[PDB]
Amino acid sequence: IAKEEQKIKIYVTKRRFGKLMTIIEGFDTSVIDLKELAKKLKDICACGGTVKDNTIELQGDHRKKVAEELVKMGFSRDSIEIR
Amino acid sequence: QVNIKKKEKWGIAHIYSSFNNTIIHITDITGAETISRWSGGMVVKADRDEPSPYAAMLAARRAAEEALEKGIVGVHIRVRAPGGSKSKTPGPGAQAAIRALARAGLKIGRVEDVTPIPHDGTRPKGGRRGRRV
Amino acid sequence: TRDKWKLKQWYIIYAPDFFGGVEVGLTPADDPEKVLNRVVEVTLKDVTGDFTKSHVKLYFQVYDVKGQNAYTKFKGMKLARSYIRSLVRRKTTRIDGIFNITTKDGYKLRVMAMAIAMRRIQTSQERAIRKIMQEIIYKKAEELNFKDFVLESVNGKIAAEIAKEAKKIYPLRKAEIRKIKVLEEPQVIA
Amino acid sequence: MRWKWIKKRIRRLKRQRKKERG
RNA sequence: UGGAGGUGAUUUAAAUGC
RNA sequence: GGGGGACCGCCAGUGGCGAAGGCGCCCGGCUGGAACGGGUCCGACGGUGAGCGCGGAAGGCCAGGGGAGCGAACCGGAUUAGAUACCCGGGUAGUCCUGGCUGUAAAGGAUGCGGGCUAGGUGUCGGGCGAGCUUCGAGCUCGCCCGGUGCCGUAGGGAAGCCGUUAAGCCCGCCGCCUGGGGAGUACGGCCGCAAGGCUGAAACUUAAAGGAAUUGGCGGGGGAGCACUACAAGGGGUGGAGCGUGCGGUUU
């Protein structure tokens, strides 16, 4: 058990052939597990994806989805910005 | 030097022949004394040229000046390779070394199939559909 | 390392107990007395017929070194991959024939013979060609001296005597001594 | 295919059999 | 003339279309 | 020079043995099956086989012992748009041995077993026989026969591929199983199993197909043969740099 909260920037990005991607950045890499979070998020989006340094990337526009899934998990509605 | 009657020396040359590298290694007829060890990745700078024939002549020419330096003029060549791990068949330095000895001037006696070949089975890597391409 | 060369000693091979002091073999080495058990390969140029021709590769071992002179015994024989692959054929057989020997001199000697079969009908006469080797060999070792008994086997004499008997039973071809290994030296009384 | 199905069937079975066992 | 084995295998050639 | 565990290339065969899973260094002891010559003995004692009983690769599991190489999981690198991979470097269970459990498969010849009948040819393994050869051993060969193991093919069968005296022919005896697809080899119930699981086994609902063989064509990051000059090499010149002419994209109007 722990806590930790962070400022979250979500936005459309760019990958090779195929569609745009969705970046979710600004999580505390000590406390939060981007690999457990991201496995959970690829399930919600239903997209492939990775942990890209300190970010999660999700293939396609998932911007309303993810914020809606992050707030559920007990993250603050007021720390999140969809751009 | 305790008096020599023949006035000719002989140095058996082990030739270890990989598709990743070539090693040439000539010793005395006993094998208890190593004059010289020279491979194919001191000659060059890169991994791709580590084998080939051209490293496997030049490697076999630097050594060949130090065997001339001892008195070794006759050489038997013992061609061999990794057999249990990989495929027994010699790589690009086998046709290369013997060309590298006829140019160096060292005489060529016996040329020999002494490569490790198991009388038996040992499981290498690579299964289900063997090693896959 | 950094031999002038002058930390390099030289010895000379004199290998008897199969022939006289075969002068062949010259030994360089660094320091004194690091070769006293080191093994030398030779074709043997004593008999330039068979011992040069079909008997390529014998191992001799310097049991001692005296005044810087190497005394060398018979340690072993081994044939090259050349031999064994060449001879063998299909729809026939290749056989192999051990015997753990004891001669009257107090040496034990491990032989493996190799004969190649005459075509069809593979059977219990195969192992009986096996049996007629281990019987005849035991009896020649007990009778003959050891130094002699390592001249005969290495020569074709043994391959020849084997064939006469074994062609009565079930005719053979391409019989030989594949390899020999010195089972036990010491003596009859240690 | 039948790989798929066997493990899907197995996972369904287990997970559900987990839910029955519980 | 048509059939069965044993082992090299070749990465220099890129997801999708109602 | 020493120590350890695994295994036994070539041999090796279109080969042999086994009910099946399966089985391969050599030697000896114990032991299963099998062929043939002679039917020498029993005198229908036979077939098949629900239930029932038994054997059953690999993986897994249990307890003990062992552990080289290899290697699920796993740990790194690369690759890649990303790679939970192909490729490479480490690596545990396991792979080995002993005792037990478990009981599954494209466990195939996708072809239950037994008997009789129905052109042939050829190769091969083992046994018999009449000869010739002989190294005087069936060692090298010819042919008939018996048992097995392949391939080719007449009559016939088959939808066709193919099968065709080793039947998928033609008959006679028994046994298992099937009755369109998907739902579903799932639910429930019971039985078995240490566990993992196995054995048995629906219905609601839904569909005008599921499927099989061959034909044609197009296609494949497939192979052979052959050309070409809108091909490429070889070769000569030049476009792309500037100025201008022109047609266009755009913008402006």
PDB file of all heavy atoms in Angstrom, chain E residues 1-4, chain F residues 14 150-153 161-163:
ATOM      1  P     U E   1      12.405 -38.866 -69.893  1.00  0.00           P
ATOM      2  OP1   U E   1      12.708 -39.864 -70.953  1.00  0.00           O
ATOM      3  OP2   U E   1      11.973 -37.495 -70.264  1.00  0.00           O
ATOM      4  O5'   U E   1      11.322 -39.530 -68.933  1.00  0.00           O
ATOM      5  C5'   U E   1      10.037 -38.926 -68.628  1.00  0.00           C
ATOM      6  C4'   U E   1       9.087 -39.986 -68.102  1.00  0.00           C
ATOM      7  O4'   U E   1       9.741 -41.280 -68.264  1.00  0.00           O
ATOM      8  C3'   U E   1       8.711 -39.899 -66.620  1.00  0.00           C
ATOM      9  O3'   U E   1       7.531 -39.134 -66.307  1.00  0.00           O
ATOM     10  C2'   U E   1       8.479 -41.367 -66.258  1.00  0.00           C
ATOM     11  O2'   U E   1       7.171 -41.838 -66.525  1.00  0.00           O
ATOM     12  C1'   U E   1       9.543 -42.072 -67.107  1.00  0.00           C
ATOM     13  N1    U E   1      10.837 -42.227 -66.410  1.00  0.00           N
ATOM     14  C2    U E   1      11.123 -43.455 -65.831  1.00  0.00           C
ATOM     15  O2    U E   1      10.372 -44.414 -65.903  1.00  0.00           O
ATOM     16  N3    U E   1      12.326 -43.512 -65.167  1.00  0.00           N
ATOM     17  C4    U E   1      13.257 -42.498 -65.027  1.00  0.00           C
ATOM     18  O4    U E   1      14.297 -42.709 -64.401  1.00  0.00           O
ATOM     19  C5    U E   1      12.884 -41.261 -65.641  1.00  0.00           C
ATOM     20  C6    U E   1      11.716 -41.167 -66.291  1.00  0.00           C
ATOM     21  P     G E   2       7.623 -37.645 -65.639  1.00  0.00           P
ATOM     22  OP1   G E   2       6.612 -36.779 -66.296  1.00  0.00           O
ATOM     23  OP2   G E   2       9.044 -37.212 -65.630  1.00  0.00           O
ATOM     24  O5'   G E   2       7.190 -37.873 -64.119  1.00  0.00           O
ATOM     25  C5'   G E   2       5.813 -37.979 -63.717  1.00  0.00           C
ATOM     26  C4'   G E   2       5.550 -39.337 -63.115  1.00  0.00           C
ATOM     27  O4'   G E   2       6.455 -40.313 -63.699  1.00  0.00           O
ATOM     28  C3'   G E   2       5.775 -39.430 -61.617  1.00  0.00           C
ATOM     29  O3'   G E   2       4.566 -39.125 -60.942  1.00  0.00           O
ATOM     30  C2'   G E   2       6.127 -40.895 -61.430  1.00  0.00           C
ATOM     31  O2'   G E   2       4.994 -41.735 -61.401  1.00  0.00           O
ATOM     32  C1'   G E   2       6.949 -41.172 -62.688  1.00  0.00           C
ATOM     33  N9    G E   2       8.372 -40.903 -62.522  1.00  0.00           N
ATOM     34  C8    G E   2       9.137 -40.008 -63.231  1.00  0.00           C
ATOM     35  N7    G E   2      10.387 -39.990 -62.856  1.00  0.00           N
ATOM     36  C5    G E   2      10.452 -40.919 -61.832  1.00  0.00           C
ATOM     37  C6    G E   2      11.550 -41.330 -61.036  1.00  0.00           C
ATOM     38  O6    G E   2      12.722 -40.940 -61.080  1.00  0.00           O
ATOM     39  N1    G E   2      11.178 -42.302 -60.117  1.00  0.00           N
ATOM     40  C2    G E   2       9.908 -42.806 -59.977  1.00  0.00           C
ATOM     41  N2    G E   2       9.739 -43.725 -59.027  1.00  0.00           N
ATOM     42  N3    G E   2       8.877 -42.433 -60.715  1.00  0.00           N
ATOM     43  C4    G E   2       9.217 -41.492 -61.613  1.00  0.00           C
ATOM     44  P     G E   3       4.589 -38.364 -59.547  1.00  0.00           P
ATOM     45  OP1   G E   3       3.211 -37.913 -59.250  1.00  0.00           O
ATOM     46  OP2   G E   3       5.702 -37.385 -59.569  1.00  0.00           O
ATOM     47  O5'   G E   3       4.901 -39.518 -58.500  1.00  0.00           O
ATOM     48  C5'   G E   3       4.912 -39.223 -57.095  1.00  0.00           C
ATOM     49  C4'   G E   3       5.296 -40.462 -56.340  1.00  0.00           C
ATOM     50  O4'   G E   3       6.208 -41.233 -57.163  1.00  0.00           O
ATOM     51  C3'   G E   3       6.051 -40.236 -55.043  1.00  0.00           C
ATOM     52  O3'   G E   3       5.152 -40.023 -53.964  1.00  0.00           O
ATOM     53  C2'   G E   3       6.813 -41.541 -54.896  1.00  0.00           C
ATOM     54  O2'   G E   3       5.998 -42.594 -54.425  1.00  0.00           O
ATOM     55  C1'   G E   3       7.203 -41.821 -56.345  1.00  0.00           C
ATOM     56  N9    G E   3       8.514 -41.311 -56.750  1.00  0.00           N
ATOM     57  C8    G E   3       8.818 -40.545 -57.851  1.00  0.00           C
ATOM     58  N7    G E   3      10.097 -40.303 -57.971  1.00  0.00           N
ATOM     59  C5    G E   3      10.673 -40.960 -56.894  1.00  0.00           C
ATOM     60  C6    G E   3      12.033 -41.050 -56.484  1.00  0.00           C
ATOM     61  O6    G E   3      13.041 -40.567 -57.020  1.00  0.00           O
ATOM     62  N1    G E   3      12.166 -41.811 -55.332  1.00  0.00           N
ATOM     63  C2    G E   3      11.141 -42.425 -54.662  1.00  0.00           C
ATOM     64  N2    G E   3      11.481 -43.110 -53.561  1.00  0.00           N
ATOM     65  N3    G E   3       9.872 -42.335 -55.016  1.00  0.00           N
ATOM     66  C4    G E   3       9.711 -41.601 -56.139  1.00  0.00           C
ATOM     67  P     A E   4       5.570 -39.074 -52.745  1.00  0.00           P
ATOM     68  OP1   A E   4       4.369 -38.862 -51.903  1.00  0.00           O
ATOM     69  OP2   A E   4       6.290 -37.897 -53.297  1.00  0.00           O
ATOM     70  O5'   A E   4       6.609 -39.960 -51.922  1.00  0.00           O
ATOM     71  C5'   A E   4       6.266 -40.519 -50.637  1.00  0.00           C
ATOM     72  C4'   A E   4       7.422 -41.333 -50.110  1.00  0.00           C
ATOM     73  O4'   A E   4       8.286 -41.685 -51.213  1.00  0.00           O
ATOM     74  C3'   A E   4       8.326 -40.596 -49.135  1.00  0.00           C
ATOM     75  O3'   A E   4       7.847 -40.823 -47.827  1.00  0.00           O
ATOM     76  C2'   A E   4       9.678 -41.276 -49.312  1.00  0.00           C
ATOM     77  O2'   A E   4       9.944 -42.346 -48.429  1.00  0.00           O
ATOM     78  C1'   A E   4       9.625 -41.735 -50.769  1.00  0.00           C
ATOM     79  N9    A E   4      10.457 -40.951 -51.679  1.00  0.00           N
ATOM     80  C8    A E   4      10.102 -40.142 -52.730  1.00  0.00           C
ATOM     81  N7    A E   4      11.128 -39.629 -53.371  1.00  0.00           N
ATOM     82  C5    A E   4      12.229 -40.116 -52.680  1.00  0.00           C
ATOM     83  C6    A E   4      13.617 -39.950 -52.862  1.00  0.00           C
ATOM     84  N6    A E   4      14.163 -39.196 -53.820  1.00  0.00           N
ATOM     85  N1    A E   4      14.440 -40.609 -52.016  1.00  0.00           N
ATOM     86  C2    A E   4      13.902 -41.359 -51.048  1.00  0.00           C
ATOM     87  N3    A E   4      12.622 -41.598 -50.784  1.00  0.00           N
ATOM     88  C4    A E   4      11.829 -40.937 -51.642  1.00  0.00           C
TER      89        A E   4
ATOM     90  P     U F  14      15.580 -46.942 -46.724  1.00  0.00           P
ATOM     91  OP1   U F  14      16.362 -45.768 -47.182  1.00  0.00           O
ATOM     92  OP2   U F  14      15.166 -47.013 -45.299  1.00  0.00           O
ATOM     93  O5'   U F  14      14.271 -47.135 -47.618  1.00  0.00           O
ATOM     94  C5'   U F  14      13.081 -47.760 -47.089  1.00  0.00           C
ATOM     95  C4'   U F  14      12.247 -48.406 -48.180  1.00  0.00           C
ATOM     96  O4'   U F  14      12.406 -47.684 -49.436  1.00  0.00           O
ATOM     97  C3'   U F  14      12.586 -49.858 -48.504  1.00  0.00           C
ATOM     98  O3'   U F  14      11.707 -50.781 -47.896  1.00  0.00           O
ATOM     99  C2'   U F  14      12.359 -49.912 -50.005  1.00  0.00           C
ATOM    100  O2'   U F  14      10.968 -49.940 -50.269  1.00  0.00           O
ATOM    101  C1'   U F  14      12.930 -48.562 -50.422  1.00  0.00           C
ATOM    102  N1    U F  14      14.403 -48.419 -50.424  1.00  0.00           N
ATOM    103  C2    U F  14      14.896 -47.134 -50.570  1.00  0.00           C
ATOM    104  O2    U F  14      14.173 -46.163 -50.728  1.00  0.00           O
ATOM    105  N3    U F  14      16.267 -47.036 -50.571  1.00  0.00           N
ATOM    106  C4    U F  14      17.177 -48.053 -50.384  1.00  0.00           C
ATOM    107  O4    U F  14      18.383 -47.797 -50.386  1.00  0.00           O
ATOM    108  C5    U F  14      16.596 -49.353 -50.245  1.00  0.00           C
ATOM    109  C6    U F  14      15.262 -49.489 -50.264  1.00  0.00           C
ATOM    110  P     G F 150       4.987 -52.191 -45.152  1.00  0.00           P
ATOM    111  OP1   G F 150       4.859 -50.936 -44.374  1.00  0.00           O
ATOM    112  OP2   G F 150       3.772 -52.945 -45.548  1.00  0.00           O
ATOM    113  O5'   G F 150       5.827 -51.884 -46.472  1.00  0.00           O
ATOM    114  C5'   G F 150       5.162 -51.396 -47.660  1.00  0.00           C
ATOM    115  C4'   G F 150       6.155 -50.865 -48.671  1.00  0.00           C
ATOM    116  O4'   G F 150       7.058 -51.929 -49.083  1.00  0.00           O
ATOM    117  C3'   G F 150       5.559 -50.372 -49.981  1.00  0.00           C
ATOM    118  O3'   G F 150       5.074 -49.045 -49.921  1.00  0.00           O
ATOM    119  C2'   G F 150       6.739 -50.498 -50.926  1.00  0.00           C
ATOM    120  O2'   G F 150       7.682 -49.455 -50.782  1.00  0.00           O
ATOM    121  C1'   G F 150       7.297 -51.842 -50.482  1.00  0.00           C
ATOM    122  N9    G F 150       6.718 -53.016 -51.140  1.00  0.00           N
ATOM    123  C8    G F 150       5.923 -53.986 -50.581  1.00  0.00           C
ATOM    124  N7    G F 150       5.634 -54.953 -51.409  1.00  0.00           N
ATOM    125  C5    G F 150       6.290 -54.608 -52.580  1.00  0.00           C
ATOM    126  C6    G F 150       6.354 -55.271 -53.837  1.00  0.00           C
ATOM    127  O6    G F 150       5.795 -56.313 -54.196  1.00  0.00           O
ATOM    128  N1    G F 150       7.104 -54.548 -54.748  1.00  0.00           N
ATOM    129  C2    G F 150       7.782 -53.398 -54.477  1.00  0.00           C
ATOM    130  N2    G F 150       8.422 -52.851 -55.509  1.00  0.00           N
ATOM    131  N3    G F 150       7.710 -52.752 -53.329  1.00  0.00           N
ATOM    132  C4    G F 150       6.975 -53.421 -52.425  1.00  0.00           C
ATOM    133  P     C F 151       3.830 -48.636 -50.821  1.00  0.00           P
ATOM    134  OP1   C F 151       3.465 -47.240 -50.479  1.00  0.00           O
ATOM    135  OP2   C F 151       2.802 -49.705 -50.707  1.00  0.00           O
ATOM    136  O5'   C F 151       4.433 -48.667 -52.294  1.00  0.00           O
ATOM    137  C5'   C F 151       5.353 -47.662 -52.734  1.00  0.00           C
ATOM    138  C4'   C F 151       5.927 -48.073 -54.054  1.00  0.00           C
ATOM    139  O4'   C F 151       6.440 -49.418 -53.928  1.00  0.00           O
ATOM    140  C3'   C F 151       4.924 -48.173 -55.184  1.00  0.00           C
ATOM    141  O3'   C F 151       4.734 -46.904 -55.780  1.00  0.00           O
ATOM    142  C2'   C F 151       5.620 -49.126 -56.134  1.00  0.00           C
ATOM    143  O2'   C F 151       6.553 -48.451 -56.945  1.00  0.00           O
ATOM    144  C1'   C F 151       6.286 -50.096 -55.156  1.00  0.00           C
ATOM    145  N1    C F 151       5.500 -51.324 -54.949  1.00  0.00           N
ATOM    146  C2    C F 151       5.427 -52.224 -56.014  1.00  0.00           C
ATOM    147  O2    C F 151       6.060 -51.976 -57.049  1.00  0.00           O
ATOM    148  N3    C F 151       4.698 -53.346 -55.884  1.00  0.00           N
ATOM    149  C4    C F 151       4.083 -53.613 -54.735  1.00  0.00           C
ATOM    150  N4    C F 151       3.392 -54.746 -54.653  1.00  0.00           N
ATOM    151  C5    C F 151       4.133 -52.714 -53.627  1.00  0.00           C
ATOM    152  C6    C F 151       4.845 -51.589 -53.777  1.00  0.00           C
ATOM    153  P     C F 152       3.376 -46.589 -56.533  1.00  0.00           P
ATOM    154  OP1   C F 152       3.458 -45.211 -57.061  1.00  0.00           O
ATOM    155  OP2   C F 152       2.261 -46.947 -55.632  1.00  0.00           O
ATOM    156  O5'   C F 152       3.399 -47.614 -57.751  1.00  0.00           O
ATOM    157  C5'   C F 152       4.006 -47.245 -59.001  1.00  0.00           C
ATOM    158  C4'   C F 152       3.901 -48.364 -60.007  1.00  0.00           C
ATOM    159  O4'   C F 152       4.221 -49.625 -59.375  1.00  0.00           O
ATOM    160  C3'   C F 152       2.526 -48.605 -60.605  1.00  0.00           C
ATOM    161  O3'   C F 152       2.243 -47.721 -61.671  1.00  0.00           O
ATOM    162  C2'   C F 152       2.649 -50.033 -61.115  1.00  0.00           C
ATOM    163  O2'   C F 152       3.258 -50.170 -62.382  1.00  0.00           O
ATOM    164  C1'   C F 152       3.517 -50.665 -60.031  1.00  0.00           C
ATOM    165  N1    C F 152       2.745 -51.437 -59.038  1.00  0.00           N
ATOM    166  C2    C F 152       2.245 -52.679 -59.432  1.00  0.00           C
ATOM    167  O2    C F 152       2.455 -53.067 -60.588  1.00  0.00           O
ATOM    168  N3    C F 152       1.549 -53.430 -58.543  1.00  0.00           N
ATOM    169  C4    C F 152       1.345 -52.979 -57.306  1.00  0.00           C
ATOM    170  N4    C F 152       0.644 -53.755 -56.471  1.00  0.00           N
ATOM    171  C5    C F 152       1.843 -51.713 -56.874  1.00  0.00           C
ATOM    172  C6    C F 152       2.530 -50.980 -57.765  1.00  0.00           C
ATOM    173  P     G F 153       0.733 -47.371 -62.011  1.00  0.00           P
ATOM    174  OP1   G F 153       0.725 -46.534 -63.240  1.00  0.00           O
ATOM    175  OP2   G F 153       0.100 -46.851 -60.767  1.00  0.00           O
ATOM    176  O5'   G F 153       0.113 -48.798 -62.362  1.00  0.00           O
ATOM    177  C5'   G F 153      -0.148 -49.198 -63.726  1.00  0.00           C
ATOM    178  C4'   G F 153      -0.606 -50.639 -63.784  1.00  0.00           C
ATOM    179  O4'   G F 153      -0.025 -51.373 -62.676  1.00  0.00           O
ATOM    180  C3'   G F 153      -2.111 -50.859 -63.685  1.00  0.00           C
ATOM    181  O3'   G F 153      -2.713 -50.850 -64.979  1.00  0.00           O
ATOM    182  C2'   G F 153      -2.227 -52.241 -63.038  1.00  0.00           C
ATOM    183  O2'   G F 153      -2.393 -53.273 -63.992  1.00  0.00           O
ATOM    184  C1'   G F 153      -0.945 -52.337 -62.200  1.00  0.00           C
ATOM    185  N9    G F 153      -1.188 -52.090 -60.782  1.00  0.00           N
ATOM    186  C8    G F 153      -0.918 -50.938 -60.083  1.00  0.00           C
ATOM    187  N7    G F 153      -1.303 -50.991 -58.838  1.00  0.00           N
ATOM    188  C5    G F 153      -1.856 -52.255 -58.702  1.00  0.00           C
ATOM    189  C6    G F 153      -2.439 -52.887 -57.569  1.00  0.00           C
ATOM    190  O6    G F 153      -2.573 -52.445 -56.423  1.00  0.00           O
ATOM    191  N1    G F 153      -2.883 -54.167 -57.873  1.00  0.00           N
ATOM    192  C2    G F 153      -2.796 -54.760 -59.105  1.00  0.00           C
ATOM    193  N2    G F 153      -3.297 -55.997 -59.194  1.00  0.00           N
ATOM    194  N3    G F 153      -2.253 -54.185 -60.169  1.00  0.00           N
ATOM    195  C4    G F 153      -1.806 -52.943 -59.896  1.00  0.00           C
ATOM    196  P     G F 161      -9.165 -40.037 -60.391  1.00  0.00           P
ATOM    197  OP1   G F 161      -8.362 -39.706 -61.589  1.00  0.00           O
ATOM    198  OP2   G F 161      -9.652 -41.423 -60.210  1.00  0.00           O
ATOM    199  O5'   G F 161      -8.305 -39.600 -59.125  1.00  0.00           O
ATOM    200  C5'   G F 161      -7.716 -38.280 -59.059  1.00  0.00           C
ATOM    201  C4'   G F 161      -7.028 -38.013 -57.729  1.00  0.00           C
ATOM    202  O4'   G F 161      -7.984 -37.790 -56.653  1.00  0.00           O
ATOM    203  C3'   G F 161      -6.101 -39.100 -57.221  1.00  0.00           C
ATOM    204  O3'   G F 161      -4.857 -38.899 -57.867  1.00  0.00           O
ATOM    205  C2'   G F 161      -6.063 -38.826 -55.721  1.00  0.00           C
ATOM    206  O2'   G F 161      -5.088 -37.869 -55.364  1.00  0.00           O
ATOM    207  C1'   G F 161      -7.503 -38.379 -55.453  1.00  0.00           C
ATOM    208  N9    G F 161      -8.362 -39.512 -55.144  1.00  0.00           N
ATOM    209  C8    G F 161      -9.022 -40.280 -56.071  1.00  0.00           C
ATOM    210  N7    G F 161      -9.732 -41.230 -55.534  1.00  0.00           N
ATOM    211  C5    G F 161      -9.527 -41.084 -54.169  1.00  0.00           C
ATOM    212  C6    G F 161     -10.028 -41.840 -53.080  1.00  0.00           C
ATOM    213  O6    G F 161     -10.779 -42.818 -53.105  1.00  0.00           O
ATOM    214  N1    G F 161      -9.567 -41.353 -51.861  1.00  0.00           N
ATOM    215  C2    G F 161      -8.730 -40.281 -51.707  1.00  0.00           C
ATOM    216  N2    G F 161      -8.398 -39.974 -50.439  1.00  0.00           N
ATOM    217  N3    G F 161      -8.244 -39.573 -52.717  1.00  0.00           N
ATOM    218  C4    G F 161      -8.684 -40.027 -53.911  1.00  0.00           C
ATOM    219  P     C F 162      -3.882 -40.106 -58.040  1.00  0.00           P
ATOM    220  OP1   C F 162      -2.579 -39.573 -58.498  1.00  0.00           O
ATOM    221  OP2   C F 162      -4.581 -41.128 -58.851  1.00  0.00           O
ATOM    222  O5'   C F 162      -3.734 -40.614 -56.542  1.00  0.00           O
ATOM    223  C5'   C F 162      -3.584 -42.003 -56.242  1.00  0.00           C
ATOM    224  C4'   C F 162      -4.626 -42.424 -55.247  1.00  0.00           C
ATOM    225  O4'   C F 162      -5.952 -42.126 -55.764  1.00  0.00           O
ATOM    226  C3'   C F 162      -4.653 -43.915 -54.953  1.00  0.00           C
ATOM    227  O3'   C F 162      -3.649 -44.278 -53.998  1.00  0.00           O
ATOM    228  C2'   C F 162      -6.081 -44.094 -54.465  1.00  0.00           C
ATOM    229  O2'   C F 162      -6.272 -43.603 -53.157  1.00  0.00           O
ATOM    230  C1'   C F 162      -6.845 -43.172 -55.416  1.00  0.00           C
ATOM    231  N1    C F 162      -7.392 -43.771 -56.657  1.00  0.00           N
ATOM    232  C2    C F 162      -8.373 -44.782 -56.565  1.00  0.00           C
ATOM    233  O2    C F 162      -8.709 -45.200 -55.447  1.00  0.00           O
ATOM    234  N3    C F 162      -8.885 -45.312 -57.702  1.00  0.00           N
ATOM    235  C4    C F 162      -8.498 -44.842 -58.889  1.00  0.00           C
ATOM    236  N4    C F 162      -9.031 -45.388 -59.980  1.00  0.00           N
ATOM    237  C5    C F 162      -7.525 -43.805 -59.010  1.00  0.00           C
ATOM    238  C6    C F 162      -7.012 -43.298 -57.881  1.00  0.00           C
ATOM    239  P     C F 163      -2.845 -45.678 -54.121  1.00  0.00           P
ATOM    240  OP1   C F 163      -1.834 -45.730 -53.033  1.00  0.00           O
ATOM    241  OP2   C F 163      -2.389 -45.827 -55.525  1.00  0.00           O
ATOM    242  O5'   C F 163      -3.969 -46.768 -53.821  1.00  0.00           O
ATOM    243  C5'   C F 163      -4.653 -46.778 -52.555  1.00  0.00           C
ATOM    244  C4'   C F 163      -5.762 -47.795 -52.546  1.00  0.00           C
ATOM    245  O4'   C F 163      -6.853 -47.358 -53.403  1.00  0.00           O
ATOM    246  C3'   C F 163      -5.441 -49.163 -53.119  1.00  0.00           C
ATOM    247  O3'   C F 163      -4.604 -49.988 -52.322  1.00  0.00           O
ATOM    248  C2'   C F 163      -6.842 -49.711 -53.293  1.00  0.00           C
ATOM    249  O2'   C F 163      -7.436 -50.010 -52.045  1.00  0.00           O
ATOM    250  C1'   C F 163      -7.526 -48.499 -53.922  1.00  0.00           C
ATOM    251  N1    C F 163      -7.510 -48.467 -55.408  1.00  0.00           N
ATOM    252  C2    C F 163      -8.413 -49.290 -56.085  1.00  0.00           C
ATOM    253  O2    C F 163      -9.173 -50.005 -55.430  1.00  0.00           O
ATOM    254  N3    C F 163      -8.431 -49.286 -57.431  1.00  0.00           N
ATOM    255  C4    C F 163      -7.681 -48.419 -58.105  1.00  0.00           C
ATOM    256  N4    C F 163      -7.796 -48.410 -59.434  1.00  0.00           N
ATOM    257  C5    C F 163      -6.761 -47.551 -57.448  1.00  0.00           C
ATOM    258  C6    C F 163      -6.720 -47.596 -56.106  1.00  0.00           C
TER     259        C F 163
END
